Short mmCIF file of C-alpha atoms in Angstrom, two decimals:
data_model
loop_
_atom_site.label_atom_id
_atom_site.label_comp_id
_atom_site.label_asym_id
_atom_site.label_seq_id
_atom_site.Cartn_x
_atom_site.Cartn_y
_atom_site.Cartn_z
CA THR A 1 145.50 -14.47 112.56
CA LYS A 2 142.35 -14.73 110.39
CA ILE A 3 140.84 -11.94 112.56
CA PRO A 4 142.33 -8.75 111.17
CA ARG A 5 144.71 -6.65 113.29
CA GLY A 6 143.63 -3.13 114.20
CA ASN A 7 144.04 -0.42 111.55
CA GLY A 8 144.88 2.40 113.96
CA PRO A 9 148.26 3.49 115.34
CA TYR A 10 147.85 2.20 118.90
CA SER A 11 148.84 -1.27 119.87
CA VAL A 12 146.07 -3.33 121.53
CA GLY A 13 145.76 -5.18 124.82
CA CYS A 14 142.92 -7.39 125.99
CA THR A 15 141.69 -8.64 129.40
CA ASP A 16 138.49 -9.92 131.14
CA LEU A 17 136.90 -8.44 134.19
CA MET A 18 134.14 -10.07 136.29
CA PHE A 19 132.85 -8.02 139.20
CA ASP A 20 131.18 -9.08 141.36
CA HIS A 21 131.42 -12.90 140.98
CA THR A 22 127.57 -13.35 140.87
CA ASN A 23 125.25 -13.54 137.89
CA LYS A 24 124.12 -10.00 138.88
CA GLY A 25 127.72 -8.73 138.57
CA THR A 26 129.29 -7.35 135.34
CA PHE A 27 131.30 -9.62 133.00
CA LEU A 28 133.19 -8.00 130.22
CA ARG A 29 136.13 -8.26 127.98
CA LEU A 30 138.15 -5.11 127.70
CA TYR A 31 140.14 -4.06 124.60
CA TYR A 32 142.48 -1.16 125.21
CA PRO A 33 145.46 0.80 123.91
CA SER A 34 148.41 -1.12 125.35
CA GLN A 35 152.07 -0.10 125.84
CA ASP A 36 154.01 -3.19 124.88
CA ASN A 37 153.33 -5.02 121.61
CA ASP A 38 155.00 -8.43 122.14
CA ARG A 39 152.50 -11.12 121.16
CA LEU A 40 148.98 -11.35 119.73
CA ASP A 41 148.22 -14.21 122.12
CA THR A 42 144.55 -13.72 123.15
CA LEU A 43 142.35 -16.81 123.10
CA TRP A 44 139.30 -16.12 120.93
CA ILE A 45 136.81 -18.63 122.45
CA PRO A 46 138.24 -19.54 125.82
CA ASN A 47 136.02 -22.30 127.19
CA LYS A 48 134.52 -25.49 125.90
CA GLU A 49 131.13 -24.55 127.24
CA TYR A 50 130.93 -21.70 124.69
CA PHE A 51 131.19 -24.31 121.90
CA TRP A 52 128.55 -26.48 123.63
CA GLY A 53 126.25 -23.39 123.85
CA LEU A 54 126.92 -22.58 120.19
CA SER A 55 125.61 -26.10 119.17
CA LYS A 56 122.59 -25.77 121.41
CA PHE A 57 121.91 -22.44 119.74
CA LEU A 58 122.48 -23.79 116.21
CA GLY A 59 120.05 -26.63 117.01
CA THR A 60 122.44 -29.43 116.08
CA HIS A 61 123.58 -32.78 117.59
CA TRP A 62 125.80 -33.39 120.68
CA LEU A 63 128.69 -33.88 118.27
CA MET A 64 128.65 -30.42 116.70
CA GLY A 65 129.76 -29.03 120.03
CA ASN A 66 133.06 -30.96 119.99
CA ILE A 67 133.74 -30.44 116.28
CA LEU A 68 133.59 -26.65 116.81
CA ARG A 69 135.95 -26.94 119.72
CA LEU A 70 138.29 -29.14 117.62
CA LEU A 71 138.23 -26.53 114.83
CA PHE A 72 138.35 -23.18 116.76
CA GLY A 73 139.42 -24.07 120.32
CA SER A 74 142.97 -22.76 119.85
CA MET A 75 142.20 -19.86 117.53
CA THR A 76 143.56 -16.58 118.85
CA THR A 77 142.70 -12.92 118.20
CA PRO A 78 145.24 -10.08 117.52
CA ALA A 79 145.44 -8.49 120.95
CA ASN A 80 148.10 -8.56 123.69
CA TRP A 81 146.72 -10.73 126.55
CA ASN A 82 146.88 -8.85 129.89
CA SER A 83 149.40 -6.37 128.37
CA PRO A 84 149.70 -3.11 130.44
CA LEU A 85 147.58 -0.09 129.71
CA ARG A 86 149.08 2.88 127.85
CA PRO A 87 149.60 5.68 130.45
CA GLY A 88 149.36 9.46 130.04
CA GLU A 89 145.91 9.75 128.39
CA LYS A 90 142.16 9.72 128.88
CA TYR A 91 140.44 7.38 126.38
CA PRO A 92 136.87 7.63 125.14
CA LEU A 93 134.84 4.59 126.15
CA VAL A 94 132.65 2.26 124.08
CA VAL A 95 130.38 -0.27 125.71
CA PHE A 96 129.58 -3.14 123.24
CA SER A 97 126.53 -5.43 123.23
CA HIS A 98 126.68 -8.87 121.52
CA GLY A 99 123.78 -10.57 119.56
CA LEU A 100 121.52 -13.47 120.29
CA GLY A 101 123.60 -16.64 120.64
CA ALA A 102 126.89 -14.74 120.87
CA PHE A 103 128.97 -13.70 123.95
CA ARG A 104 131.67 -11.17 124.87
CA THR A 105 134.64 -12.42 122.76
CA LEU A 106 132.98 -12.64 119.32
CA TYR A 107 133.39 -9.05 118.20
CA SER A 108 137.12 -8.58 118.63
CA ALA A 109 137.65 -7.48 115.02
CA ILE A 110 135.51 -4.44 115.92
CA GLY A 111 136.85 -4.14 119.51
CA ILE A 112 140.44 -4.37 118.40
CA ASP A 113 139.96 -1.79 115.63
CA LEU A 114 138.29 0.71 117.97
CA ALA A 115 141.10 0.11 120.52
CA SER A 116 143.79 0.61 117.88
CA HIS A 117 142.37 4.14 117.29
CA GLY A 118 142.58 4.98 121.05
CA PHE A 119 139.34 3.73 122.50
CA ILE A 120 138.79 1.55 125.52
CA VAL A 121 136.06 -0.96 124.52
CA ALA A 122 134.04 -2.80 127.18
CA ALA A 123 132.39 -5.88 125.52
CA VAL A 124 129.79 -7.08 127.98
CA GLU A 125 128.69 -10.70 128.35
CA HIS A 126 124.97 -10.66 128.99
CA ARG A 127 123.37 -12.83 131.61
CA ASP A 128 119.77 -12.42 130.21
CA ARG A 129 119.87 -16.05 128.84
CA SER A 130 120.57 -14.66 125.34
CA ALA A 131 124.27 -15.59 125.30
CA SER A 132 124.94 -19.09 123.85
CA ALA A 133 126.62 -19.54 127.17
CA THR A 134 128.05 -17.48 130.02
CA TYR A 135 129.15 -18.21 133.58
CA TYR A 136 129.26 -16.85 137.10
CA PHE A 137 130.33 -18.13 140.51
CA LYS A 138 128.03 -19.40 143.31
CA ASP A 139 130.23 -17.81 145.97
CA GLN A 140 133.72 -16.53 146.74
CA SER A 141 135.00 -20.13 147.36
CA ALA A 142 133.79 -21.27 143.95
CA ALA A 143 135.42 -18.21 142.39
CA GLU A 144 138.67 -19.07 144.18
CA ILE A 145 138.79 -22.58 142.68
CA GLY A 146 137.45 -21.65 139.21
CA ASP A 147 134.30 -23.68 139.82
CA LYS A 148 131.99 -22.06 137.28
CA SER A 149 128.24 -22.25 136.95
CA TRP A 150 127.27 -22.01 133.34
CA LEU A 151 124.02 -20.58 132.03
CA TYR A 152 122.91 -21.51 128.52
CA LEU A 153 120.71 -19.79 126.02
CA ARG A 154 116.97 -20.19 126.65
CA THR A 155 114.81 -21.21 123.70
CA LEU A 156 111.40 -19.55 123.87
CA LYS A 157 107.88 -20.46 122.81
CA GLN A 158 106.17 -18.31 120.20
CA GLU A 159 103.49 -17.24 122.74
CA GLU A 160 106.05 -15.78 125.19
CA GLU A 161 108.52 -14.29 122.63
CA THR A 162 107.16 -10.72 122.72
CA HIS A 163 107.31 -10.54 126.51
CA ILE A 164 110.46 -12.54 127.20
CA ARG A 165 112.50 -10.64 124.50
CA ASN A 166 111.35 -7.24 125.93
CA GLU A 167 112.36 -8.23 129.47
CA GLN A 168 115.73 -9.39 128.04
CA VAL A 169 116.47 -6.14 126.28
CA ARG A 170 115.70 -4.27 129.54
CA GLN A 171 118.04 -6.65 131.39
CA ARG A 172 120.72 -5.99 128.68
CA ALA A 173 120.27 -2.19 129.00
CA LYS A 174 120.69 -2.50 132.78
CA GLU A 175 123.92 -4.56 132.24
CA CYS A 176 125.39 -1.97 129.84
CA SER A 177 124.67 0.79 132.42
CA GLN A 178 126.16 -1.25 135.24
CA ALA A 179 129.24 -1.98 133.11
CA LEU A 180 129.64 1.73 132.47
CA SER A 181 129.09 2.50 136.27
CA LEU A 182 131.76 -0.07 137.16
CA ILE A 183 134.31 1.37 134.75
CA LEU A 184 133.56 4.98 135.90
CA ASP A 185 133.83 3.88 139.61
CA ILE A 186 137.19 2.34 138.80
CA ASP A 187 138.46 5.46 136.90
CA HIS A 188 137.67 7.37 140.12
CA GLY A 189 139.61 4.83 142.25
CA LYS A 190 137.05 2.26 143.54
CA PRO A 191 138.81 -0.90 144.74
CA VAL A 192 137.72 -3.86 142.64
CA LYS A 193 138.59 -7.53 143.07
CA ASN A 194 138.38 -9.26 139.78
CA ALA A 195 136.70 -12.74 140.29
CA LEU A 196 138.93 -13.88 137.46
CA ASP A 197 142.50 -14.07 138.67
CA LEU A 198 144.42 -12.42 135.86
CA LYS A 199 147.65 -10.45 135.73
CA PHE A 200 146.11 -7.17 134.61
CA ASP A 201 145.87 -4.76 137.54
CA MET A 202 142.53 -3.01 137.36
CA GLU A 203 143.72 0.00 139.31
CA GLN A 204 145.75 0.90 136.20
CA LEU A 205 142.45 2.34 134.97
CA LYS A 206 142.35 5.16 137.63
CA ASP A 207 142.03 8.48 135.74
CA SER A 208 142.26 6.73 132.34
CA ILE A 209 138.67 7.44 131.14
CA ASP A 210 137.18 10.49 129.28
CA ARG A 211 133.96 10.25 131.20
CA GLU A 212 132.30 12.70 128.84
CA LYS A 213 133.05 10.66 125.71
CA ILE A 214 130.97 7.46 126.14
CA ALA A 215 129.18 5.46 123.36
CA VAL A 216 127.25 2.14 123.20
CA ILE A 217 127.73 -0.11 120.04
CA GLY A 218 126.01 -3.49 119.44
CA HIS A 219 125.11 -6.10 116.84
CA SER A 220 121.62 -7.49 116.18
CA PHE A 221 119.98 -8.17 119.66
CA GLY A 222 122.85 -5.79 120.65
CA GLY A 223 121.45 -3.15 118.32
CA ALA A 224 118.10 -3.28 120.10
CA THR A 225 120.23 -2.90 123.30
CA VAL A 226 121.82 0.25 122.06
CA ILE A 227 118.41 1.87 121.78
CA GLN A 228 117.06 0.59 125.05
CA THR A 229 120.35 1.73 126.71
CA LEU A 230 120.24 5.22 125.22
CA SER A 231 116.56 5.50 126.21
CA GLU A 232 117.51 4.54 129.83
CA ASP A 233 120.90 6.15 130.42
CA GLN A 234 121.78 9.68 129.46
CA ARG A 235 125.58 9.14 130.12
CA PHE A 236 125.86 7.51 126.73
CA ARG A 237 126.21 10.35 124.29
CA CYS A 238 125.50 8.28 121.16
CA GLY A 239 124.86 4.79 119.82
CA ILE A 240 125.63 2.73 116.70
CA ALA A 241 123.22 -0.17 116.00
CA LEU A 242 124.89 -2.78 113.74
CA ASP A 243 122.15 -4.62 111.98
CA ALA A 244 119.64 -4.08 114.75
CA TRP A 245 116.97 -6.60 115.43
CA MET A 246 114.04 -4.43 116.60
CA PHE A 247 111.57 -6.99 117.80
CA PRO A 248 112.57 -6.84 121.51
CA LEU A 249 111.90 -3.06 121.77
CA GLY A 250 108.63 -1.69 123.20
CA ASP A 251 106.43 0.64 121.04
CA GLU A 252 106.98 3.29 123.73
CA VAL A 253 110.79 3.48 123.40
CA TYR A 254 111.07 4.84 119.78
CA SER A 255 109.82 8.25 120.83
CA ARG A 256 112.25 8.31 123.82
CA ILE A 257 115.77 8.47 122.41
CA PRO A 258 117.54 11.87 122.78
CA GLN A 259 120.98 10.84 121.53
CA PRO A 260 122.37 10.60 118.01
CA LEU A 261 121.73 7.05 116.63
CA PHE A 262 123.58 5.45 113.66
CA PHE A 263 122.01 2.39 111.98
CA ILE A 264 124.51 0.33 110.04
CA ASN A 265 122.87 -2.56 108.11
CA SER A 266 123.91 -5.53 106.01
CA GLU A 267 121.93 -6.03 102.78
CA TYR A 268 120.61 -9.53 103.45
CA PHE A 269 119.46 -9.46 107.11
CA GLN A 270 116.89 -6.69 106.75
CA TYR A 271 113.11 -6.88 106.27
CA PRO A 272 110.11 -4.51 106.21
CA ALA A 273 108.78 -5.21 109.73
CA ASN A 274 112.35 -4.37 110.98
CA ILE A 275 113.04 -1.24 108.85
CA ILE A 276 109.56 0.04 110.00
CA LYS A 277 110.65 0.00 113.67
CA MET A 278 113.94 1.63 112.73
CA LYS A 279 112.11 4.50 111.02
CA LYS A 280 109.87 4.96 114.04
CA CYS A 281 113.11 6.19 115.73
CA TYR A 282 113.20 9.13 113.27
CA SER A 283 112.46 12.84 114.07
CA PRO A 284 113.32 16.26 112.46
CA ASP A 285 115.00 17.35 115.73
CA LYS A 286 116.78 14.16 116.90
CA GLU A 287 119.78 13.14 114.81
CA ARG A 288 119.57 9.76 113.00
CA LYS A 289 121.73 8.12 110.33
CA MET A 290 121.28 4.93 108.24
CA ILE A 291 123.51 3.03 105.84
CA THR A 292 123.39 -0.43 104.20
CA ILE A 293 126.57 -2.35 103.25
CA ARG A 294 126.07 -3.98 99.84
CA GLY A 295 126.25 -7.77 99.42
CA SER A 296 126.76 -8.11 103.15
CA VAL A 297 125.20 -10.59 105.47
CA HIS A 298 124.26 -10.57 109.16
CA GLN A 299 127.55 -12.30 110.14
CA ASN A 300 129.81 -9.72 108.41
CA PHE A 301 129.74 -7.78 111.73
CA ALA A 302 130.90 -10.80 113.89
CA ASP A 303 134.24 -12.56 113.93
CA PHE A 304 132.87 -15.88 112.55
CA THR A 305 133.15 -14.19 109.11
CA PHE A 306 136.93 -14.54 109.54
CA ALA A 307 136.92 -18.05 111.09
CA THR A 308 136.41 -20.20 107.95
CA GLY A 309 137.48 -19.81 104.28
CA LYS A 310 135.46 -18.27 101.45
CA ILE A 311 133.59 -21.36 100.18
CA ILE A 312 132.55 -22.80 103.58
CA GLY A 313 131.98 -19.24 104.81
CA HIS A 314 129.86 -18.47 101.85
CA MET A 315 127.91 -21.76 102.22
CA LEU A 316 127.14 -21.27 105.91
CA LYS A 317 126.25 -17.57 105.42
CA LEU A 318 129.25 -16.45 107.48
CA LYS A 319 130.27 -14.48 104.41
CA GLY A 320 128.51 -12.35 101.80
CA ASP A 321 129.41 -11.25 98.24
CA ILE A 322 131.43 -8.32 99.48
CA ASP A 323 134.74 -9.35 101.02
CA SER A 324 134.93 -9.74 104.88
CA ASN A 325 137.81 -7.41 105.62
CA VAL A 326 136.30 -4.85 103.21
CA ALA A 327 132.86 -4.93 104.80
CA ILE A 328 134.31 -4.58 108.30
CA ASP A 329 136.63 -1.69 107.37
CA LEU A 330 133.62 0.11 105.96
CA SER A 331 131.53 -0.44 109.14
CA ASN A 332 134.47 0.59 111.34
CA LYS A 333 135.44 3.84 109.50
CA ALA A 334 131.84 4.92 109.23
CA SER A 335 131.50 4.23 113.03
CA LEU A 336 134.65 6.17 113.88
CA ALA A 337 133.47 9.16 111.76
CA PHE A 338 130.19 9.08 113.60
CA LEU A 339 131.77 8.71 117.09
CA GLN A 340 134.11 11.61 116.39
CA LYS A 341 131.12 13.70 115.31
CA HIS A 342 128.85 13.10 118.22
CA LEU A 343 131.38 12.53 120.98
CA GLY A 344 133.59 15.57 120.20
CA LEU A 345 136.75 13.64 119.42
CA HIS A 346 140.02 15.21 118.26
CA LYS A 347 141.20 12.70 115.67
CA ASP A 348 141.41 12.29 111.82
CA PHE A 349 138.15 10.19 111.59
CA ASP A 350 135.98 12.90 109.86
CA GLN A 351 137.94 11.76 106.74
CA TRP A 352 135.19 9.10 106.59
CA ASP A 353 132.20 11.43 107.01
CA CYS A 354 130.97 10.53 103.48
CA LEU A 355 130.50 6.95 104.65
CA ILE A 356 127.80 8.19 107.10
CA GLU A 357 125.78 9.59 104.19
CA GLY A 358 126.22 6.44 102.01
CA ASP A 359 129.13 7.58 99.69
CA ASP A 360 131.12 4.55 98.46
CA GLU A 361 130.48 1.96 95.72
CA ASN A 362 129.74 -0.45 98.56
CA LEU A 363 127.04 1.39 100.50
CA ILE A 364 123.37 2.35 100.21
CA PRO A 365 122.27 5.58 101.95
CA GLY A 366 119.41 4.47 104.21
CA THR A 367 117.92 1.15 103.07
CA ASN A 368 116.72 -0.44 99.83
CA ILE A 369 113.58 -1.61 101.69
CA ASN A 370 110.59 0.78 101.43
CA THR A 371 107.74 0.71 104.06
#
């Protein structure tokens, strides 16, 4: 695989859960420490409509849709599809929020690496009309026959952006909370019928969560989601915003975030008006960190940075100067250090504590932007 395997000891399974079947239900892909390690058989982008949504989002022709499908429709990601859960432990839980124009399967490099260090990761698919595409079922009968209703990204007008994006980040915060409530209900034995008919038995998750050790991670729109989610939902003990895009957030929220918050930026995405909102989250009392990964671009945090080669990747801005596997390792280790600090984990991850302060040839403490 072009998507790197996890760098932790645990082997990794993956599955998808939709409950309930409506567009008000939760939809997520789960990455988890698995028992068996047979095959790395997981389909990266599982449906043609995701490629069609990606072209809509990119603003290109009807044809681009099919080209993308041609090129990436059979690409897999290094996790064991539906492989059983590893028994005899309670895992800390990460909920993960995707960016504008993404969806639940595009951050497996991150999900798989967290899982391989003994996390369960719940990667939500949002239904706020920010995903390039997503689906739901009209009713039980539809769900039975796999008759999906697809919902594509909404393009907005300039005059409604401020309001529509704020409503979307509140919808996203509600969906992260609901995903966490679903997983915690399951851990305590709630019966759940997965609208997707997959081998993985959800009841396996009874008593498999460390319900004290919960964190929300997200990229870009997903980084704004982190903050809205922490502001709204005290069960999350901490958040990591990967290259947050701060425009959706209300003025009022920056003063209203109790939890530790880690900002991990690329070099090229960032701008004054964005770093200003970040810094508004700062306080002597409340714990905040910031690092910048040098030479990196927005896409270094998403799997598309592994989907092409260096020259196309570099051309399309899927890749930065810094190498892709190197950038992602840095983000991941820094993240782990910070989750083990503010979750109370009992692992070796504080070996990367220096990364939180900006201590590697490839990081900037804080930002190079001034404000």
